[PDB]
Design a protein around this ligand. Structure first.
Ligand SMILES: CNc1nc(Cl)nc2c1ncn2C
Length: 164
């Protein structure tokens, strides 16, 4: 079924996350955390207070796919056992210092070929696959993109709904 999923996405906000490598997305799936650059960190903290759900939709660069989507369960927090992110060039551990907790909604992939009919009004109506890390996706486009993912039958949204 999709009814609880649609309830979680109701009036949600959506942000595109572009990860430079697969390792960090795998780590996020295993540990339920994400970290971003300070400019996007501030944006996500503001959104977390503003909406019933904030959804991160993940895409590893050069993969041609999205790798899933997750809901923020907290604002960013510092002061913890360092998440062993794989850092690309120019990326330092301090720039990824804020850790958001997230609850995965779908850990299944979706190829960009299946989202070619969705454009994002907040990025000049370019295909939704196009955008830098942190690009906000307008409500209707983000809802339809999330609904395109294959169902993840390993997940129970009952606990997510009560976090709302
Ligand atoms: C753990 N967070 C991240 N990991 C990698 Cl590899 N790239 C990122 C990123 N946040 C923004 N970008 C471009």
């Amino acid at each position: 079924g999709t009814s609880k999923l649609k309830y979680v996405l109701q009036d949600a906000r959506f942000f595109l996350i572009k990860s430079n490598n697969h390792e960090n997305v795998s780590l996020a799936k295993a540990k339920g955390v994400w970290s971003t650059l300070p400019v996007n960190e501030k944006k996500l903290n503001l959104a977390f207070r503003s909406a019933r759900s904030v959804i991160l939709i993940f895409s590893v660069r050069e993969s041609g796919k999205f790798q899933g989507f997750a809901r923020l369960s907290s604002e960013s927090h510092h002061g913890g056992s360092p998440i062993h992110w794989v850092l690309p060039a120019g990326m330092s551990a301090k720039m990824l210092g804020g850790v958001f907790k997230i609850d995965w909604i779908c850990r299944r992939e979706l190829p960009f070929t299946k989202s070619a009919h969705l454009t994002n009004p907040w990025n000049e109506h370019k295909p939704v696959k196009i955008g830098r890390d942190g690009q906000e996706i307008e409500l209707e486009c983000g809802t339809q993109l999330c609904l395109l993912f294959p169902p993840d039958e390993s997940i129970d949204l009952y606990q997510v709904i009560h976090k709302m």
